[PDB]
Design a protein around this ligand. Sequence first.
Ligand SMILES: C[C@@H](c1cnn(Cc2ccccc2)c(=O)c1C1CCCC1)n1nc(-c2cncc(O)c2)c2c(N)ncnc21
Lengths: 161, 918
Amino acid sequence: EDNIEAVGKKLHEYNTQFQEKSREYDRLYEDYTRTSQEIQMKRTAIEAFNETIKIFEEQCQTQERYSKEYIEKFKREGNETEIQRIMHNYEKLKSRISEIVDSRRRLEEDLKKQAAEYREIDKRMNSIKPDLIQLRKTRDQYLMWLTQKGVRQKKLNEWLG
Amino acid sequence: NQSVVVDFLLPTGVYLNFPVSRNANLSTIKQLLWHRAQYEPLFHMLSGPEAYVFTCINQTAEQQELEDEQRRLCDVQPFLPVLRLVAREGDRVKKLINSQISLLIGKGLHEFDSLCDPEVNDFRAKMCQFCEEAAARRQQLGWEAWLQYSFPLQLEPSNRALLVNVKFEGSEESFTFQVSTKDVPLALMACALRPEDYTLQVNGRHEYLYGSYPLCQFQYICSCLHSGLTPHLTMVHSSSILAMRDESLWSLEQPFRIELIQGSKVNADERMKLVVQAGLFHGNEMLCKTVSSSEVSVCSEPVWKQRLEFDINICDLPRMARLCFALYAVIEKAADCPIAWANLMLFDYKDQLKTGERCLYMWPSVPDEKGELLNPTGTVRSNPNTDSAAALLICLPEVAPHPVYYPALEKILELGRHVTEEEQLQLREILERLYEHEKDLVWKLRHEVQEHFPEALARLLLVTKWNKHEDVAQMLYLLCSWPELPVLSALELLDFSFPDCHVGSFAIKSLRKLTDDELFQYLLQLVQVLKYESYLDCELTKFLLDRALANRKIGHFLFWHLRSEMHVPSVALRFGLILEAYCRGSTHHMKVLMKQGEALSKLKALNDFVKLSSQKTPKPQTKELMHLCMRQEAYLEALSHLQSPLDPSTLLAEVCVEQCTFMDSKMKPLWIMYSNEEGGSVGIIFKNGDDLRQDMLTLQMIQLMDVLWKQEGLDLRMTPYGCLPTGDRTGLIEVVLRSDTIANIQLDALLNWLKSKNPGEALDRAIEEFTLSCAGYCVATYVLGIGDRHSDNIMIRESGQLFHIDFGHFLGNFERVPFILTYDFVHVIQQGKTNNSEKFERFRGYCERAYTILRRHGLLFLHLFALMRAAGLPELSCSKDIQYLKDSLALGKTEEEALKHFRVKFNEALRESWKTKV
Ligand SMILES: C[C@@H](c1cnn(Cc2ccccc2)c(=O)c1C1CCCC1)n1nc(-c2cncc(O)c2)c2c(N)ncnc21
């Protein structure tokens, strides 16, 4: 189908293209691995927000049960002062929950943008694989054709990169 | 800055918020809390501070009660700075252990509950209870036992006079006297009194000398004799050791079928079309032909809803049958893209044939050299990124109105049970040393194989037709009366080609004869083989946990091999459950591991700073900045007074900060020097971003070579230093001291360095040390296919021992690697002479005997490497990799032929040596 030096040169070209797409694949697979590790970290962080918030809500439940007695025990004894203190303290607990919640939401928004990044990477990995696979094979067929033609290993070594 | 604003939630419902020092311990913070809470409502209802414990949410998202109030807030590392006061009560011991496990293994226990998986819940209940029971048994056995569990003997693979310095615990004065180089330790003790309630400790180490062996069989002693140094020991009373302890299926001829419903979250080229390929396997063999879907257009959420019917009946499917899918994109029939893949066991962990819908979260396919349709070798665990991974939705149909189970052993042997000389010579031929024709013969003469060739069990297992319940029943019948095989053969049977649980179990039964010394040589491979298991409760797990529980040094290295992969999704669950259980059986060691994890966690941050700084500004300054960072109260404490992870009997005591520095390569590895109250000085390299697994394996093989060598009286003075992966591209390397690189020493220069380190009549020792070690490393590197060997990665000890470092690359990879002799080493071997053939001949001898010893244990290396393929090292992927070693060791050749070819390559390497130098 061709002559040897022309086949050997094209082997060098196809090999060079193979090494380059192979490196590019490796770049993506690395982003894949990292991004996967990060997403999982964010997911567990979202769980920690949730457990934290849960804790604040038990504190609220505790405040409503426990306080009751002490608001009615202070009303009779004229301590609308002590009652005020408990309720403003309580009001301070509540505003803090809203902050924690606001942070939880920032995270979920970040996890959202990153889940999508993960899918674009996997999509780009998937659009490359065909060429990668095709290049490996074409390269291997040129090596074969040259081996059968009796080309020595030294020549095949120069051409491979 | 220092402080951080912390939310406090009091049990009255009251909430306070104020700054505390990041450095303050919880005990201090509790005082500050009380002091501020007296001015807030409802103070008078609180009990005292000691009646309550702080709770936080930790980094692993679990609630933790902070029982140890000497801990600093910055070490506690709460998710948000929120501390809650709760009552003490309700089994504080379980609570504490549970919380520590999560932090230690890097994975919250709650993530196992979250799965709502009975297989997982069953594993933890059985194994944790087993591990706890062993632990409780161990406490009730006396002090000897505790000593053996905790500090097993360090013995050489195996009469001049010997003087030794002995002392007693808590006393300056010491007793130097000559003693029996071959008298059992007791007699040293009995003597020093001028008995049976003592052991001897090696000063400044947790190495102990006891048992019925003689003194020069101990590493410490043996190293002392060779060095010339006087042993230094401490007698320790029993009590002071207690004070450490104390403080139906076969009637279903309907064919196997599945319903392919839908995929989800597929990310493929919208021009192309999508196909699922499905096949059935037992291990790596196909049970029947493959069957494929129709093309459907690419979309995110493609829909097939087709029956796929296989060419095998439900009655024929073996226990370990495995359904394997691959999602592929094809350029619409008018390079197929392999998208992703997933495997599924057809019987569950309790033996029941599965029914119903399954959602398989798939793994992405990697374009590799084999390019097989499907990936039957891959894990049967689903991808745990369930939120974003692609998935397949399939439906196993019903088969009978009751559940069906793979039949019980009894019924397998029910079915399983029930001479030519020409045939008895063809078989012998085949096994003295498969293809279609020979498989039929071996199957026919399987009874003969058992009687006469028990060692060929592996071959017979592969000939057997795992798509035929009759055959399978017959094979298992023999398997159950098969006589016990040697360790070597058992190691073959733990490979992926032998997925049947009867096989695994027969293998482990043969591994139980392993000594702790020998098992330790193989520990790493045995770990990797866990990746080939289908179920969580398996015999190999149980065997590894058994031996971890009986020997603390084994449990130490098992923990680090398992912990170092907790970031890998396909094993995080399995390794995590093993680690949990291991921990519950080793609460003492847990305290050592906890200390090591915080040292390491500090080295990570200390290392990330040094990479980041090094970009900004030059080394001398970054060095001083590294030092300031280190002396911070909390860095310093966490980095000081731990047991080394490389060797838990070594104490890393005081960090010598002004000697701490780092290497100049891209990830800036840290060189950390220590000094303990014993040698006297120890070093470690902390790496973060380099992969160490290639270095570990190579160093483990060099070590195994040293043992096998030493076990035949050949001591080649090797330096197989520690390498321990501990995390995601993180781990430690033992510094070899009083050593330097060839490149440094060169810029008769090697020979002069040696002269200066060994003046006068110790030069002959140095040279002989160099000769022995030069042979060992020459043979090692040749056998393993290690090129890229230069003066930067070859070092020399002041004793004269030469050794290689920082391995990189093996089995030919970036091309057989010739045996290699360096003229500059030949020179030293020859004592500075042009021709010293007496010497040079000895060296060739050493080389030849070493190679000869390794050939005799060649199948051992091959099996060990075969199991390491599970690790996914780029350099040890395939069968040709194993082929490199068969050829390097000339195992296809008689020994005589092997030595003759070695000799030839040896001489060519001698010729070559002069030509490179010119
Ligand atoms: C190369 C030499 C070395 C490295 N770094 N510094 C610090 C330095 C680096 C740069 C500037 C200043 C200090 C070293 O001073 C050394 C040696 C040079 C002479 C004294 C010690 N080395 N490399 C390993 C090793 C590394 N990576 C993987 C392995 O498997 C083994 C090693 C070792 N285990 N023991 C001793 N020296 C070892």
